[PDB]
Task: structure prediction
Amino acid sequence: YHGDSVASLGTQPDLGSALYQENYKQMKALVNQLHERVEHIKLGGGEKARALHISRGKLLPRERIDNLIDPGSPFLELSQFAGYQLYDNEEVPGGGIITGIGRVSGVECMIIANDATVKGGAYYPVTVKKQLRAQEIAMQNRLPCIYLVDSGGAYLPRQADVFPDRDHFGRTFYNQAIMSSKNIAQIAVVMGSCTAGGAYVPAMADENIIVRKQGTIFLAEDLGGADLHCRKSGVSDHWALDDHHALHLTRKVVRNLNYQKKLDVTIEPSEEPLFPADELYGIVGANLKRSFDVREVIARIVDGSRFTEFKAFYGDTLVTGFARIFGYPVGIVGNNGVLFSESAKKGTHFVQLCCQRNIPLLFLQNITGFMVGREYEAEGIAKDGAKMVAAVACAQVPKITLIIGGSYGAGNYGMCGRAYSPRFLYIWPNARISVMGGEQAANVLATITKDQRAREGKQFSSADEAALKEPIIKKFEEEGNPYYSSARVWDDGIIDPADTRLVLGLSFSAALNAPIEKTDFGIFRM
Amino acid sequence: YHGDSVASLGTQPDLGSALYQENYKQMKALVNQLHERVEHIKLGGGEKARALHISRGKLLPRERIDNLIDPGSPFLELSQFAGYQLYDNEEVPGGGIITGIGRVSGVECMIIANDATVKGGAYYPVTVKKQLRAQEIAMQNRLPCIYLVDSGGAYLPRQADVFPDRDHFGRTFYNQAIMSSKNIAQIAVVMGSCTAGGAYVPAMADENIIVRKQGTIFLAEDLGGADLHCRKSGVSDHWALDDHHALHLTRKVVRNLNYQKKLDVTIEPSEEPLFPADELYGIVGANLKRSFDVREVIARIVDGSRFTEFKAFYGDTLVTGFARIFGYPVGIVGNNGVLFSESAKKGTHFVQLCCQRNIPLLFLQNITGFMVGREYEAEGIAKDGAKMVAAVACAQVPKITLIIGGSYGAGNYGMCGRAYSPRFLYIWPNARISVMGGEQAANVLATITKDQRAREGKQFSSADEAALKEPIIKKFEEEGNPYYSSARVWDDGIIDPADTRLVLGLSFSAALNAPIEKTDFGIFRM
Amino acid sequence: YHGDSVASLGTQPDLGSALYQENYKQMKALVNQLHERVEHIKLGGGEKARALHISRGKLLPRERIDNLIDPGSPFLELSQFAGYQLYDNEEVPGGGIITGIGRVSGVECMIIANDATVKGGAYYPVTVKKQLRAQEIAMQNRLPCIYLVDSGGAYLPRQADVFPDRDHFGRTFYNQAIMSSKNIAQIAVVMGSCTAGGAYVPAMADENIIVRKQGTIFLAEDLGGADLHCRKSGVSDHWALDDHHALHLTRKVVRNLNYQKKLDVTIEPSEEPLFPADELYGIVGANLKRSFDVREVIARIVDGSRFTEFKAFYGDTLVTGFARIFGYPVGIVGNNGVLFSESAKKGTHFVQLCCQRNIPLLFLQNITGFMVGREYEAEGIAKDGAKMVAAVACAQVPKITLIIGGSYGAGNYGMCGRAYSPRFLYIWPNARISVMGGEQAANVLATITKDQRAREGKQFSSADEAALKEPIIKKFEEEGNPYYSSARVWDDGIIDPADTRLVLGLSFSAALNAPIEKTDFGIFRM
Amino acid sequence: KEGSIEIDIPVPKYLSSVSSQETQGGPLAPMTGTIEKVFVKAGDKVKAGDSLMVMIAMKMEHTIKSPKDGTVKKVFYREGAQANRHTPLVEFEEE
Ligand SMILES: O=CCCCC[C@@H]1SC[C@@H]2NC(=O)N[C@@H]21
Result:
């Protein structure tokens, strides 16, 4: 019996209020800035490179993905901003590689395609990291991997950051071998030149497809990717006339995987939230100093804006409860202020509940600056904050993290930061991430100097202090920008707040391809 | 019945030969250079810092380890050269942290001690990587972790490379939580100030020891590490008067772990090699262009110089066989020339044999430059080299890699490079590691330029070519030096060739603390 | 999404062509010969024996099966030709036993009924082998066994071939005990006299049914099968008035097994092939020297004549690909010429793919004579042919073999011969099976004699050679005939080519009653 | 109600059978009908538009014409024969 009437979250914001008008205007500008920058990245290398690419009869990398996935199906692209201003004088749109999750023959798959128009498809250090992140996502969720291979090899000027280390180019083949041993299909389509060391990617794949004239595989047509590779050498499993033919063959290969998705969780009919998503612009804004009720964010992403809060009046700075997104059950943990001992205990209790019932967890990070409280006897927080860091780490249910505000210090770890292997991590265009907030850092620097100056007896003037402080503030702002963080692969993308519900729905759906394991906890330091 | 007489490897080198005299002289100089540099690193921060450290009643970090381990037991230190010239103007001896494996109360444990004399124990980016490597070693071999905590927090000027990412400081607590859940004991001894974010390390430990006056734990004595932490807060499990008392308590804690080592492999009595180890100086030398028989190296490290070669006459550029080191069975794979299709097939067959019988594997990397052969139809090699990369990756037996020569290109991957998770990786002082050898790179660069110059029609003069080539050669030499590689944590240390047998014996003994699992292979592309 | 259009196999044969006309005429005669011989076997012992059997109030053995199975359901009879001309002067139609798979109460079961009209139901050596084969089929597929017991005991004149050995009559009770321990129901219905040693069959069954007046069980009515057996002795679980009543009771017993079939494989809607099956007569013919494209055979048995070929241009003498029969996924391996090194490698790769995805395998054996190639350096073939023999043996997916042509030498083993435990093995009326083809054998014999004659110096004349050759050719023809092979239980029946699709559909459906296990391979000798 | 429109979806080349049988053995009978006239001997040189046979079907005369300039290899029907719809009438020598 599911006919019980229940209460719903959310309230109607005051559209006429000046605060709402200002917050909407600021957030809208950030979203528009995000959109137009992606448009530029969409063009890859440029008109001359794109014209040359098409002149050889090859499809553009994004057109290949469009033809590969099922007609009209959504495509979840990841790390669109990798390599954004990462290198001083070189522009590398998207890192030279396009990765995302789409549906092929009704099966969710991870698609990894080299962008040959960007530096001829050479592998920059960020390119390796982006690919390795994609492989990690595919393995953790048991998603078949499809490699649209068109590459020019490693970027020699930066070889030391590509070749040698464990998380360097060598790890790519290690991941392929491991996934194959686990029956996670590895499919490679050589749609262009495969350079030295990239010839392994077609070979290490379970099934392989090579284009007749364009494809070349060699550790050019005669040496590799030849009819020799297809027939005499036997490296090729399927022979394709052109790019369209190869993509058609790939869809057939996936259809023969003999795989059917099975769900471990209970399912209920989906319902839209009771409030518009675009109202999040006015509610949240771009000023991290102002505070908002995280429940408002929840009310606009969960099915029917229905939410069962757990321990509502205890540790109120943290909000935990049960909801459903697109029918899936989810346990939501979101910050609503500074973390306290009660908040950490409340979170630790909640995480155990979700792990016991095998319920996916969603974290909404919005940590607060220390301008309000200098110390507050933080020693008490240390004893309890660890209990949450330890429960979150050991949890085996799928975990997704969304940074809707600040993310500073140990608060990042307790809320399932990147270091704690959430299945996905997304950030809103207004976020900031740093070891500490910029102002606090300045104060700390100031005290040390003033006191040391005092030992010397030299006077640290008021002007002297300000001069010291300004560079520090600037560095922290520059390095906490959402773009700096996404340029390196610290998150899986910057998403428009109006798209939060859709992105979460796609992400949780993909994460459910793998069975949920039993959670084993360490010692809880009572 | 084990009374059968068998043949033994090795031959007596010609000590009078000029080649032997020159090779011994060159290798000896490298070893002497290695020794004196370690002596300097042994001193840590310096006399002023060391004097200040002792003036507070605290033991020096290396004296702490000496008192912690069993009397007279050997100590296997790791990554002694981390941070060597890594940072432009800052000297960070050993990365500010000392890690190694020693015996405590008869149990092999991983010891991780902060060096407070180096930058006050602040965490540099290399410091985090060194600690994370130590934790990875402890988990893979089920070694209890002992943290001698005396730290000053993260190095703010380089925060972006310490805090945020998955392999950044946050991962340290994640590793502690995971090991605790697996019953791998985590013991923390706070022998000095624990700064913000380091207070978690005592809390996340299974058992904890704090010094009465020196120790402070706070997210100074009143705020944390107080009798408050020991009694009022309860974060402390044991209370110690001084450094000597704390080390005595630590030994008692380990003795109560209720752990006993069990061996999965057959054991035979140990025997010394039939040839002196120091002869390796003359045999190997420092000139990578000259070639030597890897069997000579094997004859001087295995018990009794006894070796059963597998497929001796097939793919002779690779040597594979069975031997024993300190009684443990080992399968040895070593390069004896350029890799061929037969060599890769022979290696793949051998690795399957060792995995089937649960025999540890040892790799001796000495890959050859392409000066001898420009291409040799390397396309054939690609089809087969992958079969070895794929077998080596999936092998679950303990793997140890020793680079006794060059390590270039895909040959590194096939011989269990760093990317393939060998339990340990060591390098001799004469090694070089790069994407390709320096000369080849220059030639490649030259061709591209000469041809492009030809399209322009501008003449690329002979002088012009040489000028282009010289910088490239220099870069490659600088970046392939054993010191560059060890300064970053790419290997676990640079070892004297005369110490090869001892280091391997200690490493394999530690690796046997974990049970050997069954190996699951992927698809072998026949 | 399954809306993609795909290519289909098959071509329209030239009905007017003389070759097609001749091939159709020859194959049709073989099929007509097969049909009329079965009609004679259908009559069992004969009119006098059948009249006597009915005069006692008992149903004829085949009428019992008709009433036992569900109304209108197909019945897959096995080894109809067992004992055909096997014994010099004794006619034993069907071996004195009728075995097959039919549906009882919606459950697929193995039915084993003694034919009392044939030699009074005595057990000939072939009778034991036929029953043991049926039990092996039931165990491998988890099919409940129903024994319609009406037997006269062992045939004393041939006791040495019935009683003593492991695969002799004793094994029948061993199989019953083993299947019972695995929860594979064993149901016995005593519908006639149970002789000495057959009394065990009712006793060893999980549930037992005995007819009131006809049934007798004793290690006649008073001694056994008495109301004594039903009540006083308790050997009988159910008491039946007549044959019709007993069959009705049997259906009730099966309905109470609490069994429901579960499928491990993905299912798609069934589709008929795009070409008529009877065209196989013209395409194949009866002349093994002529060659045909195996793809034509495939095009006329798979759903919609849809086939995805794997490695089409490599090792073209072997055809491998994925298809579906009645909705089930199947991997097909068929000969298209002489086996080569490439063909064996291609097969070994394909078999690993099917085992990884748990896809049933179908083999179409048509091996070629050595008239075309005397040796062709067959030593190369030995190194590779073994790789296929070893992969095929270890495969745990259900395997079905169909001999549509010759089956000679080691080619039989590589294509899943009887020795490799295929779930079922069928042969077309035109097949031949031998160690080598007859002609080759003659040549071999000729050479030995001619040379030995040369040592003597006695002249081996041309006439002498021919005289030697003729008997050998005759023996080989006689012993490779489909009837010789089926008379002994080497295959499960001779089937009309037009019935190939139906027989395969029934066989694969039965084989899916057991869960598919994971495949463990040995060492692949690379 | 305005009208009816037919739009054709292009067929990918790969799906189209590559190298479809190219030679066509003469125009196929428009329908099942008696052969009233034969204008070609067993070996005859013909040019495109040369009448080969005349067939009457349900009282409607059709004249078969030469598809190619190739010489005639053979004739499958004679006068007075009834030829079924789409059955080969003439065989042309391979060129
Ligand atoms: O034979 C079927 C009816 C139409 C053809 C008959 C022809 S018309 C010319 C001649 N005059 C007749 O009355 N009948 C035939």
In short: DSSP finds 17 helices and 17 strands in chain C.
